Every structure is written in structure tokens, then in C-alpha cells.
Design an enzyme around this catalytic site. Sequence first.
Site, PDB file in Angstrom:
ATOM      1  N   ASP A 146      38.084  41.905  49.553  1.00  0.00           N
ATOM      2  CA  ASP A 146      38.169  42.542  48.268  1.00  0.00           C
ATOM      3  C   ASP A 146      36.802  42.404  47.523  1.00  0.00           C
ATOM      4  O   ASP A 146      36.219  41.350  47.524  1.00  0.00           O
ATOM      5  CB  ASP A 146      39.310  41.973  47.408  1.00  0.00           C
ATOM      6  N   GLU A 150      41.877  40.123  38.041  1.00  0.00           N
ATOM      7  CA  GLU A 150      41.384  40.379  39.365  1.00  0.00           C
ATOM      8  C   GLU A 150      40.038  39.730  39.719  1.00  0.00           C
ATOM      9  O   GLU A 150      39.827  39.360  40.841  1.00  0.00           O
ATOM     10  CB  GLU A 150      41.340  41.875  39.620  1.00  0.00           C
ATOM     11  N   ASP A 157      32.560  51.654  41.405  1.00  0.00           N
ATOM     12  CA  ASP A 157      33.658  50.727  41.203  1.00  0.00           C
ATOM     13  C   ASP A 157      34.795  51.442  40.423  1.00  0.00           C
ATOM     14  O   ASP A 157      35.885  51.482  40.860  1.00  0.00           O
ATOM     15  CB  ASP A 157      33.131  49.617  40.361  1.00  0.00           C
ATOM     16  N   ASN A 178      25.971  47.636  38.826  1.00  0.00           N
ATOM     17  CA  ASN A 178      26.335  48.902  38.342  1.00  0.00           C
ATOM     18  C   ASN A 178      27.848  49.250  38.709  1.00  0.00           C
ATOM     19  O   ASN A 178      28.149  49.414  39.872  1.00  0.00           O
ATOM     20  CB  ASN A 178      25.422  49.878  38.978  1.00  0.00           C
TER      21      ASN A 178
END
Length: 129
Positions: A53, A35, A91, A87
Site C-alpha cells: 500500500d 490510512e 494519488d 506531489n
Amino acid sequence: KIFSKCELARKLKSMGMDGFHGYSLANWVCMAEYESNFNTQAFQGRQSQGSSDYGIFQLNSKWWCKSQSHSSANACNIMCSKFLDDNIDDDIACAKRVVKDPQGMSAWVAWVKHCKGKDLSKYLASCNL
């Protein structure tokens, strides 16, 4: 920041990803590799309407976080901008939320085309965890 395979593998184990919703650490790491090539700054503007994205998990704004001109459904309740960050904590928490949907990990394309069909039993083998 670019993570290494094992570095990341360690990170994710840490934050409870090994087996999280039936998915092995191998799975998660592979998604990442495919990805973003493990890039926290990876970004992809989709030429669709306002969905791009973000970060290492290539998190879409149509669904998942807010953009700018581009409003979102914001499933994850975060500014998509939060993901282009060094960081990886949000996510991941966003990633855990994504997985919950019917499609699960197939939400992630790179994952489907590169990892779903693969035998990942050796994927992590070189890793000190």
C-alpha cells in the site's frame, strides 16, 4: 511530506473532492488521517503476495498501480512508486477511480473502522476553507 488536517482539506476541495461520488470532504480527509496519518511517504508491505500500500491513500498494488517483482491489474494506470511522492495529484485521481467500485470508500479499511460510523459534521469545523 506530512499534511495537516486543514491543509489537506484545502487541497482536496481544490481538486474537486467535496461531494465527489457522494462523499463529503470530511470523509476523504478522515480516510487519509486513518490510512496514513496524512503521510505522503506512508507505505505498508502486505505479507500476502505482491501487494503493498502506497502514499497518503495507502494505495494497493494488487489492484491499483504497478509494483515490481509484483505485476498489477493497474486500475489507475500508474507506477505505485509515483504515490510515495511529495506531489498528491495522481494519488487523488487514483483515489477518485477507487471510489467508483461497489465498495466505494470501504475499499479503505482505516475509513470503515474509524470514519464510516462516525458523525463527521464537526470534523472540519476548525478549518478555514
